[PDB]
Amino acid sequence: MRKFGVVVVGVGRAGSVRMRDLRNPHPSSAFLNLIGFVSRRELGSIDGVQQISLEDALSSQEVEVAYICSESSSHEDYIRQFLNAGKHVLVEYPMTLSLAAAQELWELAEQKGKVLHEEHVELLMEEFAFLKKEVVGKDLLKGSLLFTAGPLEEERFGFPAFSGISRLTWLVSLFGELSLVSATLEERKQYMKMTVCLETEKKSPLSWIEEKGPGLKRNRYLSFHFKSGSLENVPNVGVNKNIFLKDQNIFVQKLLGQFSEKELAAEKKRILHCLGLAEEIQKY
């Protein structure tokens, strides 16, 4: 059995889940081989997995795939280094905090012949499976999505339109490419609220709000209105199941060339579309 060598860079929340998924038996994982991890800190060994240096990780012929799971701000730096070193790259969203940087990195992967992949577990959640099915038949009059959470260090996870690009990705996936009508932002040092206004190609208004402050329980609130009727809640649709694993599975399919050019292009377009809006929003 021919397995790709993997190293997980940044052993945080995201990183731990990846290591655990690699180490447990699954179809995706059968094709991979976790050779070690890279951390800014001196950890030694997580689950019999050894720490290894950035230096030795880029060097190694054994290592063919880098999972970048560090804070958003360092993503761009690491992606570039691993692509230049000749490795395939999986990176958690947002892949970068600028459109131009994303463009450069895709173009580099393309040139170096490797897969670059922005993880999007939000598209694999139950809540979204349901919405994908509910929206199918419909023509949206107006709609709104609010996400609340605790404070987040912008110096390392970036501006909220980037840190919450997942919410945007929903709206884009559900309703096509969107354009920016306006965007306001309140800050107050440890609170913050971002109010965005988007339109769909058929010119119908979507509202997007991210609120982050202390005492705020991570939550999602959603309301869609169509010509046929409205949806005020997602109903109880059960708990999310291995969203990260599932994303690994898409990545391995890429490594194996199981997706079409048509498909890989649609995805690239979408990712850039969002990164761009995040930027357009941050300007306004």
Ligand X SMILES: NC(=O)c1ccc[n+]([C@@H]2O[C@H](COP(=O)([O-])OP(=O)(O)OC[C@H]3O[C@@H](n4cnc5c(N)ncnc54)[C@H](OP(=O)(O)O)[C@@H]3O)[C@@H](O)[C@H]2O)c1
Residues annotated as catalytic (active site), given as ranges: 92-93, 119, 122, 166-167
Of 192, 166, 120, the closest CA to residue 278 belongs to: 166
Residues 6, 35: contact at Cβ < 8 Å? yes
Q: Which residue has the tokens 């890279």?
A: 38
Q: What would the x/- binding string for a second copy be over residues 131 to 170, using CB under 8 A? A: --x--xx---------------------------------
Scanning 10-18, 28-36, 157-165, 259-267 for contacts with a second copy by CB under 8 A, the matching segment is 28-36
From start to end of 101-233, where are the E strands?
Answer: 116-118, 140-149, 178-188, 191-200, 205-212, 219-226, 230-231
Q: Smallest distance, Å, CB 42 to a second copy?
A: 32
Residue type, 54: L
Which lies closer to a second copy via its Cβ, residue 44 or residue 229? 229
Does position 173 bind a second copy by CB under 8 A? no
Which of ligand X, a second copy, none does 36 bind, CB closer than 5 to 8 A by kind?
Answer: none
Of 219, 233, 270, the closest CA to residue 134 belongs to: 233
Q: Smallest distance, Å, CB 232 to ligand X?
A: 26
Q: Smallest distance, Å, CB 258 to a second copy?
A: 6
In sign, the C-alpha dihedral spanning 254, 257, 260, 265 is positive
Residues 25, 31: contact at Cβ < 8 Å? no
Q: Scanning residues 49 to 88, which ones bind ligand X (CB under 6 A)? A: 69-72
| Site residues, a second copy (CB under 8 A) | 1, 24-27, 29-31, 126, 129-130, 133, 136-137, 235-238, 241-242, 249, 252-253, 256-258
